[PDB]
Amino acid sequence: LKHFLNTQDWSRAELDALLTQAALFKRNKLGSELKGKSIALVFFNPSMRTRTSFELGAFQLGGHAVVLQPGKDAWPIEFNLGTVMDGDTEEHIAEVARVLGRYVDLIGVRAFPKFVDWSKDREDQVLKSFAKYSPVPVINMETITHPCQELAHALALQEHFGTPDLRGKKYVLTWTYHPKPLNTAVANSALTIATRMGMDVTLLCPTPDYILDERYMDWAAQNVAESGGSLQVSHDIDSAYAGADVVYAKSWGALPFFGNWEPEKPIRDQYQHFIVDERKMALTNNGVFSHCLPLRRNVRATDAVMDSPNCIAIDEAENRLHVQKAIMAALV
Amino acid sequence: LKHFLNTQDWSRAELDALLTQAALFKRNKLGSELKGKSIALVFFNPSMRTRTSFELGAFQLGGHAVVLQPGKDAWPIEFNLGTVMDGDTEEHIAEVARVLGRYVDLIGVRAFPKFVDWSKDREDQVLKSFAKYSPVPVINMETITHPCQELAHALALQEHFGTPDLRGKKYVLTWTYHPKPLNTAVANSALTIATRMGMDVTLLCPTPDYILDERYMDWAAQNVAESGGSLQVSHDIDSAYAGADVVYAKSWGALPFFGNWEPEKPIRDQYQHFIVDERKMALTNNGVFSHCLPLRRNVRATDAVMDSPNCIAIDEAENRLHVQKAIMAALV
Amino acid sequence: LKHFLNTQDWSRAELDALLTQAALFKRNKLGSELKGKSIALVFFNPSMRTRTSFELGAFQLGGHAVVLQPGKDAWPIEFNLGTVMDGDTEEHIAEVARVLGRYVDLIGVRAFPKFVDWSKDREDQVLKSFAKYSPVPVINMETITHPCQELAHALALQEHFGTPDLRGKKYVLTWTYHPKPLNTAVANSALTIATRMGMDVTLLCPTPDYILDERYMDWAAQNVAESGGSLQVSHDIDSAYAGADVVYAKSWGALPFFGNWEPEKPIRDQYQHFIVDERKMALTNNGVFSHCLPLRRNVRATDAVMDSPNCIAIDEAENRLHVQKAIMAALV
Ligand SMILES: CC(=O)N[C@@H](CCCNC(=O)CP(=O)(O)O)C(=O)O
Ligand SMILES: CC(=O)N[C@@H](CCCNC(=O)CP(=O)(O)O)C(=O)O
Ligand SMILES: CC(=O)N[C@@H](CCCNC(=O)CP(=O)(O)O)C(=O)O
Numbered sequence: 001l002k003h004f005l006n007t008q009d010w011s012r013a014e015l016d017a018l019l020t021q022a023a024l025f026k027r028n029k030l031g032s033e034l035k036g037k038s039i040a041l042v043f044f045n046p047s048m049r050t051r052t053s054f055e056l057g058a059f060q061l062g063g064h065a066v067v068l069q070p071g072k073d074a075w076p077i078e079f080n081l082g083t084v085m086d087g088d089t090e091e092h093i094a095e096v097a098r099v100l101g102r103y104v105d106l107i108g109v110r111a112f113p114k115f116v117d118w119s120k121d122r123e124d125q126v127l128k129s130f131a132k133y134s135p136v137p138v139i140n141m142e143t144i145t146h147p148c149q150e151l152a153h154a155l156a157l158q159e160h161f162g163t164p165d166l167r168g169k170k171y172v173l174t175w176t177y178h179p180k181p182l183n184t185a186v187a188n189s190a191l192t193i194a195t196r197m198g199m200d201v202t203l204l205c206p207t208p209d210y211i212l213d214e215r216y217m218d219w220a221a222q223n224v225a226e227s228g229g230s231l232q233v234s235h236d237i238d239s240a241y242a243g244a245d246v247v248y249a250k251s252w253g254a255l256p257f258f259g260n261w262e263p264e265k266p267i268r269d270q271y272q273h274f275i276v277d278e279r280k281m282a283l284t285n286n287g288v289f290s291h292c293l294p295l296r297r298n299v300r301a302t303d304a305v306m307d308s309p310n311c312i313a314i315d316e317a318e319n320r321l322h323v324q325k326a327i328m329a330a331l332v
Numbered sequence: 333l334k335h336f337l338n339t340q341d342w343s344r345a346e347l348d349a350l351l352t353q354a355a356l357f358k359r360n361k362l363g364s365e366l367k368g369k370s371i372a373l374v375f376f377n378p379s380m381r382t383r384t385s386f387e388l389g390a391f392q393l394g395g396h397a398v399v400l401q402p403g404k405d406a407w408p409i410e411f412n413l414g415t416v417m418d419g420d421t422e423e424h425i426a427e428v429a430r431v432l433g434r435y436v437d438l439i440g441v442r443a444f445p446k447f448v449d450w451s452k453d454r455e456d457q458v459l460k461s462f463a464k465y466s467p468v469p470v471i472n473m474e475t476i477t478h479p480c481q482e483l484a485h486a487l488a489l490q491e492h493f494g495t496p497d498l499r500g501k502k503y504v505l506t507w508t509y510h511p512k513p514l515n516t517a518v519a520n521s522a523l524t525i526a527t528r529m530g531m532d533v534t535l536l537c538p539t540p541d542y543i544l545d546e547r548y549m550d551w552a553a554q555n556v557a558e559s560g561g562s563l564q565v566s567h568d569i570d571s572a573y574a575g576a577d578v579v580y581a582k583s584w585g586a587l588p589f590f591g592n593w594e595p596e597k598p599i600r601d602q603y604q605h606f607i608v609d610e611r612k613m614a615l616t617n618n619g620v621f622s623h624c625l626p627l628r629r630n631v632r633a634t635d636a637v638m639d640s641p642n643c644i645a646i647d648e649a650e651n652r653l654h655v656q657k658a659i660m661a662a663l664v
Numbered sequence: 665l666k667h668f669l670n671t672q673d674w675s676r677a678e679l680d681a682l683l684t685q686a687a688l689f690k691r692n693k694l695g696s697e698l699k700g701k702s703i704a705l706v707f708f709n710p711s712m713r714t715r716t717s718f719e720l721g722a723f724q725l726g727g728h729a730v731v732l733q734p735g736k737d738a739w740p741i742e743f744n745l746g747t748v749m750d751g752d753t754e755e756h757i758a759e760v761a762r763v764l765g766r767y768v769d770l771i772g773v774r775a776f777p778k779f780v781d782w783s784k785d786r787e788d789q790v791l792k793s794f795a796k797y798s799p800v801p802v803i804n805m806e807t808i809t810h811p812c813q814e815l816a817h818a819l820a821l822q823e824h825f826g827t828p829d830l831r832g833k834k835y836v837l838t839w840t841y842h843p844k845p846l847n848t849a850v851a852n853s854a855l856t857i858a859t860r861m862g863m864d865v866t867l868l869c870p871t872p873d874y875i876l877d878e879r880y881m882d883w884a885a886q887n888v889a890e891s892g893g894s895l896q897v898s899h900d901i902d903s904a905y906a907g908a909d910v911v912y913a914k915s916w917g918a919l920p921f922f923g924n925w926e927p928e929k930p931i932r933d934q935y936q937h938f939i940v941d942e943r944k945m946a947l948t949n950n951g952v953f954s955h956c957l958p959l960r961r962n963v964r965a966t967d968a969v970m971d972s973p974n975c976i977a978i979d980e981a982e983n984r985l986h987v988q989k990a991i992m993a994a995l996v
Contacts, residue, residue: 030368036694038720048406048428052398052435056370059396064723066716069405073733074712075958084962086843091958094970095977096712099957102982103716179418293431294407294423298416306426313427318434362700380738380760384730384767388702391728401737511750625763626739626755630748638758645759650766 003131003138004327007147008192008219012226015151015196016164021326022155022319033329034063039106041141042068044126047110049293050141050148053321054108061325066104079129093126097133105332107134110141112183118258122213137331139324145216146185148327149292150193152319156312157197157246160288167198167228169245170285175205176300177272181253181261186292188216190248191231195220198227204240205233206271209254209264237274241283249276249291249300276301281310290316335463335470336659339479340524340551344558347483347528348496353658354487354651365661366395371438373473374400376458379442381625382473382480385653386440393657398436411461425458429465437664439466442473444515450590454545469663471656477548478517480659481624482525484651488644489529489578492620499530499560501577502617507537508632509604513585513593518624520548522580523563527552530559536572537565538603541586541596569606573615581608581623581632608633613642622648667795667802668991671811672856672883676890679815679860680828685990686819686983697993698727703770705805706732708790711774713957714805714812717985718772725989730768743793757790761797769996771798774805776847782922786877801995803988809880810849812991813956814857816983820976821861821910824952831862831892833909834949839869840964841936845917845925850956852880854912855895859884862891868904869897870935873918873928901938905947913940913955913964940965945974954980 007015025031041054051067058065068074077096078089085092100107109130113121127143140147158164171194173187191212194201201220205211211233220231234240241247257264275298281289289305290313297303305311339347357363373386383399390397400406409428410421417424432439441462445453459475472479490496503526505519523544526533533552537543543565552563566572573579589596607630613621621637622645629635637643671679689695705718715731722729732738741760742753749756764771773794777785791807804811822828835858837851855876858865865884869875875897884895898904905911921928939962945953953969954977961967969975 036724038723040716043405046405046407046422048400048402048423049431051405052372052400052432055398056396056435059370060368064720066719067405068712068716070712072405073707073710073715073731073736075710078961082962082967085960086963090710090960091712092961092970094961095957095959095981098978099713099981100716102978103720103985293427295427296417296422297410297424297426298414299418303414306424314430314434317427317431321435375737378737378739378754380732380734380755381763383737384704384732384764387730388728388767391702392700399737404737625759627759628749628754629742629756629758630746631750635746638756646762646766649759649763653767 001137002331004147004331005127005131005138005140006145007150007196012196018151018323018326018330019155019158019164021329022151022323025325026322029060031060032062034058034061034332037063037105037332038066038103039063039108039328040066040068040100040104041108042070042110044070044111049317049320050110054141054324057321057325057328061329079125093129094133097130098135101135104136106137106139106328108139108141111143112185113144115181115253116259118255121258122215139327139331142185144185144188145192146189146292148320148324149186150189151323152316153190153290154193154197155319155323156290156316159315160312169199170243171199171201171246172240172244172248173201173203174240174247174249174274174276175210176249176251176274176276177268178251178296178299181257181264182251184212184252184255187250187252188212190250191216191220192223195223195229195231196227198229200230202232202234202240204237205235206274207235209256209267213255237280238283241280244284244287247276247281247284247287247289251300275299276305278302278304281305286310288312293317333469334663336479336663337459337463337470337472338477339482339528344528350483350655350658350662351487351490351496353661354483354655357657358654361392363392364394366390366393366664369395369437369664370398370435371395371440371660372398372400372432372436373440374402374442376402376443381649381652382442386473386656389653389657389660393661411457425461426465429462430467433467436468438469438471438660440471440473443475444517445476447513447585448591450587453590454547471659471663474517476517476520477524478521478624480652480656481518482521483655484648485522485622486525486529487651487655488622488648491647492644501531502575503531503533503578504572504576504580505533505535506572506579506581506606506608507542508581508583508606508608509600510583510628510631513589513596514583516544516584516587519582519584520544522582523548523552524555527555527561527563528559530561532562534564534566534572536569537567538606539567541588541599545587569612570615573612576616576619579608579613579616579619579621583632607631608637610634610636613637618642620644625649665801666995668811668995669791669795669802669804670809671814671860676860682815682987682990682994683819683822683828685993686815686987689989690986693724695724696726698722698725698996701727701769701996702730702767703727703772703992704730704732704764704768705772706734706774708734708775713981713984714774718805718988721985721989721992725993743789757793758797761794762799765799768800770801770803770992772803772805775807776849777808779845779917780923782919785922786879803991803995806849808849808852809856810853810956812984812988813850814853815987816980817854817954818857818861819983819987820954820980823979824976833863834907835863835865835910836904836908836912837865837867838904838911838913838938838940839874840913840915840938840940841932842915842960842963845921845928846915848876848916848919851914851916852876854914855880855884856887859887859893859895860891862893864894866896866898866904868901869899870938871899873920873931877919901944902947905944908948908951911940911945911948911951911953915964939963940969942966942968945969950974952976957981
């Protein structure tokens with residue numbers, strides 16, 4: 001049984017086929033690939049684009065999406081095995097995934113880490129549990145990685161540059177400020193897809209403490225050897241932006257401080273100048289800027305940058321709809 | 333780009349066409365005006381009729397409605413420009429409206445005032461923000477006015493009286509009691525549509541403090557000159573009901589007390605006798621009674637009045653479905 | 665007007681026809697029995713299977729389900745008549761049921777008791793109110809009984825045993841442990857359907873205090889006389905399980921303690937050995953085990969029992985989808 005948990009799990013040819021099918025769906029949105037079929041969108045966290053894009057995608061392909069929010073409308077779920085369920089959880093993922101598998105043809109799942117034990121979070125327990133117990137294909141709607149975002153992002157870049165081949169492009173994945181620590185998922189995914197596409201990647205962050213988990217630094221290195229790009233880490237803004245073709249921002253809490261954010265607060269606070277602004281973008285090679293959204297204006301990026309014609313965030317968000325339809329069509 | 337934010341923005345001919353298309357849809361509910369199309373119903377406040385009627389309306393016309401509740405499932409939204417988004421809001425309406433515009437063909441929005449600063453509330457910021465940034469038509473699902481309710485109400489009256497022409501009808505918009513201050517939206521809308529239809533309107537309220545915002549008193553005066561009706565303010569129940577053909581109730585907090593309800597409480601409390609009862613209705617010319625709902629029984633109106641054959645509240649509620657389908661069909 | 669509030673309200677022939685139509689729908693899931701029609705699923709409590717199965721069922725038959733949660737998205741509802749609605753409720757069920765009846769073709773309702781006054785809860789006020797005021801058929805999605813679960817359960821048993829006739833089967837309805845008191849609905853329903861099918865039923869519970877309401881003990885006795893089975897009460901585990909063909913578990917709070925759970929806690933706590941385990945199941949005649957779900961593992965039943973091939977809980981859950989489609993098709 002094939003799932004869509006991470007692009008890293010798929011061959012380059014399969015990924016290229018997904019991207020191409022996404023372009024096709026963008027030209028002909030209505031279809032019958034999911035006629036009479038359904039998908040359960042299980043949300044453990046908030047969402048606007050993902051929920052809307054998946055729900056509409058199913059509809060446009062003749063299918064139906066059932067939106068579930070455990071703890072809100074559905075029952076809270078337990079993921080640990082062999083435990084005595086006398087706590088807050090009502091049922092085990094084993095029964096939930098099996099039951100859903102008797103109803104729907106696909107299951108999507110969104111579950112951000114709890115930001116208390118990166119050791120536990122990095123295990124991707126929720127997503128892995130669904131993939132293990134479900135009799136139907138499972139789709140990552142974002143946990144510790146965000147593969148659907150990766151493809152939407154990649155398609156947006158290919159469209160912007162007018163070609164599927166992005167080799168030779170300088171790509172800057174930049175950390176950005178926020179008072180609270182956020183999920184590294186999007187950052188981990190960008191690093192993964194940028195290198196899998198063979199671009200020259202630079203991970204720009206305030207200090208070595210903000211470097212991404214080794215799992216993703218390794219996927220990147222492996223992808224660079226495979227695609228012909230390159231990986232690099234930097235803590236110097238100007239040399240990072242200089243001549244860049246793409247600038248992708250995202251805010252995340254330093255991994256080494258998971259479960260102890262009190263001391264890392266004064267650290268990130270001295271780096272709010274990492275905000276993407278005109279001065280920085282002016283240093284690029286007329287580079288494009290994008291963000292996964294939601295984006296806090298004048299925090300992650302200034303109003304001026306968001307409204308400039310070089311911002312393709314809206315295009316990337318639109319593409320979530322098209323690439324996800326390709327994913328659902330491939331798995332069904 | 334044409335939106336449906338207020339009936340006052342549309343010509344009389346366009347409104348008549350909407351009402352007529354609504355009557356047509358009431359006779360043939362299934363259609364294909366929205367085949368393959370979608371609408372995002374963004375709710376910032378509770379709703380039963382609006383959500384249900386819009387969702388079903390889209391379905392019956394071959395479309396699909398995506399129900400969103402910022403702060404509940406979707407991310408909280410920021411509407412002020414140039415602000416540093418380091419508060420509770422996650423994204424700006426600029427990105428939300430643009431993103432949604434890449435997914436759906438229409439956007440509906442519901443957002444009641446906060447009852448703290450009528451000066452701010454009366455600006456209709458949320459609705460105006462959507463209308464400004466959205467690339468697709470926007471529909472008011474109730475903010476400070478309730479245009480969809482206006483049409484459902486107008487159609488119900490036309491059906492009850494057996495004619496599209498309501499000139500010559502005595503219409504009583506009456507304030508009613510409630511311990512807490514409520515939105516004037518429905519009252520503002522009734523005053524607007526009753527006068528646009530050319531009826532003889534009387535705004536019955538406890539004191540001058542309960543008079544509606546000047547914006548709507550002005551729309552009314554302008555509508556009276558245009559339609560041939562008349563506007564009048566009264567604080568005397570008996571002379572108001574006498575010979576009335578229509579009695580429409582609604583409870584609202586006095587505008588002059590927005591942000592300071594402590595002192596206006598003892599004021600409204602001495603007027604709970606404004607409740608619509610049999611004694612009052614008996615004074616009318618076998619007049620019909622209606623309310624937008626939800627309605628608190630034996631508070632806004634007595635059980636006897638709600639169950640009498642002259643109560644057309646259920647018919648008006650049904651019409652929300654039909655007039656909204658006409659609105660969606662016209663904007664698409 | 666015919667509703668589906670309890671199987672006890674339907675003749676045996678009608679129930680057999682429902683079960684048969686459910687089997688047909690299980691073989692051909694797509695149909696047009698609800699083409700262009702809709703159902704309002706009103707949830708006053710959490711749900712995963714019911715919401716998902718009803719929503720998908722409507723879709724597969726060409727219809728559309730509108731999911732409503734009073735107090736969450738829809739307005740809170742009042743069920744008492746003649747009261748002065750100046751409390752938490754916004755509208756009366758009279759208007760809600762009538763309005764919904766102008767929109768949808770069917771109404772489903774879920775509302776668990778409040779566990780404070782079994783005398784009040786046992787009146788099934790919510791369900792009865794909907795059935796009284798609604799102009800369209802009403803479906804019990806679980807209140808104090810769970811008729812949709814009854815049919816899913818019955819179909820699962822008929823499929824397991826390879827025959828529609830279950831007479832001669834030893835059926836054990838067993839109480840199971842949980843720190844908090846739960847609804848007897850599922851237990852009341854199992855007792856009802858097991859006896860209506862003519863099986864030899866044994867209600868196994870810790871003490872006479874855990875015996876089900878007399879209303880259901882009476883339905884059972886009446887059903888036994890009609891179907892040829894038998895009813896029995898027991899507080900001895902071993903003699904209950906011995907030679908049993910079916911074991912159905914469920915946890916519920918002792919009725920005599922509604923509104924005073926402090927003293928009944930130490931009582932149930934000495935009976936957590938009622939948990940369904942291998943030792944108990946080994947005593948049966950290779951009996952099948954099932955539960956309505958959600959199920960707390962290693963509390964209601966052990967991991968080993970849930971994962972054994974004799975557990976048909978997943979099949980029963982799947983059947984909720986099929987029997988409900990038969991119910992909707994029959995009522996429409
Ligand atoms: C603040 C916050 O927690 N943000 C998330 C955004 C995830 C990417 N964004 C999306 O997938 C779009 P939508 O479906 O609308 O959420 C994060 O940091 O991972
Ligand atoms: C108490 C309260 O806040 N009431 C609202 C009702 C609005 C009119 N009613 C509707 O649009 C119907 P539905 O979609 O079910 O809300 C108000 O006073 O403006
Ligand atoms: C713990 C709890 O309160 N449980 C409920 C389960 C009802 C049966 N179960 C269902 O109908 C399945 P779903 O639609 O997913 O809830 C009870 O005890 O009655």
